[PDB]
């Protein structure tokens, strides 16, 4: 994707303040709570039986860190997302070969979590810039 300078600024400034230890777990966990079929993709992750359990599961939280890492990698190489993510998808064998819609669902849950954590600061223009990035990272990660 190509971001305008204001869009790049809108993303970068708020991204610097994200709690990188928690926000990924919260988004990945809400994905499993809100869209329960996604738990099938993570049946190797243990107990996903209730909202509280999902949200406290340690491998949720761990791979949540990795989801943010993929966002940061994407933001750093917006003009070559496929080259950025090629090793990431391939190291996974078939695990990332699910419908592209679930990557768009994950990106939108992440947007919801950023709105939850930043409140008024997650303005409509800031959201719009993030939507460009989460769309690009979604397309590349499902390829």
């Amino acid at each position: 994707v190509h971001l305008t300078p204001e869009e790049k600024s809108a993303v970068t400034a708020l991204w610097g303040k994200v709690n990188v230890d928690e926000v990924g777990g919260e988004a990945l966990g809400r994905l499993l709570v809100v869209y329960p079929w996604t738990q099938r993709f993570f049946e190797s992750f243990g107990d996903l039986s209730t909202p509280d359990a999902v949200m406290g599961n340690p491998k949720v939280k761990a791979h949540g860190k990795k989801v943010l890492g993929a966002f940061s990698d994407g933001l750093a190489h917006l003009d070559n997302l496929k080259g950025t993510f090629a090793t990431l998808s391939e190291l996974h064998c078939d695990k990332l070969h699910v419908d592209p819609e679930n990557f768009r669902l994950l990106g939108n849950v992440l947007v919801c979590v950023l709105a939850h954590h930043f409140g008024k600061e997650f303005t409509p223009p800031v959201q719009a810039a993030y939507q460009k990035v989460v769309a690009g990272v979604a397309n590349a990660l499902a390829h």
Binding site: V33, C112, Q127
Partner: protein, 141 residues
């Protein structure tokens, strides 16, 4: 079908929204127009600039329609009958656009209701908005 706990969760979140309902609808619309610019093509006659009284008035209409659906949550096809005919049969809204507005409504609630937007309530609100969207897309001809 929405469960009793979904219905409680939706009504609780609307309770906390309170009288800001109209302003949050306007904000959700603005979020939709900026994030998903193809949706602006349904509003070529509106001024979509920030602070636009037309977006403010329309956001109040949308919030009032959601509140009517909340208030008649077990009778949503009948309650939303006129609006389903308008959107699907007259305006020919692409059904994808209802997912985009629902997402922006969720983002708006999350940005204003940090305590209420738990994962359980988020799941309930998503189910409710998808139910409204299903009704509003049910009458294509």
């Amino acid at each position: 079908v929405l469960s009793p706990a979904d219905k409680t969760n939706v009504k609780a979140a609307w309770g906390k929204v309170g009288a800001h309902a109209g302003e949050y609808g306007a904000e959700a619309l603005e979020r939709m127009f900026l994030s998903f610019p193809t949706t602006k093509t349904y509003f070529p006659h509106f001024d979509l600039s920030h602070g636009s009284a037309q977006v403010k008035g329309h956001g109040k209409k949308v919030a009032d329609a959601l509140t009517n659906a909340v208030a008649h949550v077990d009778d949503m096809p009948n309650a939303l009958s006129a609006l389903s005919d308008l959107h699907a049969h007259k305006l020919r809204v692409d059904p994808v656009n209802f997912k985009l507005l629902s997402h922006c409504l969720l983002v708006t609630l999350a940005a204003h209701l940090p305590a209420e937007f738990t994962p359980a309530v988020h799941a309930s609100l998503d189910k409710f908005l998808a139910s409204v969207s299903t009704v509003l897309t049910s009458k294509y001809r």
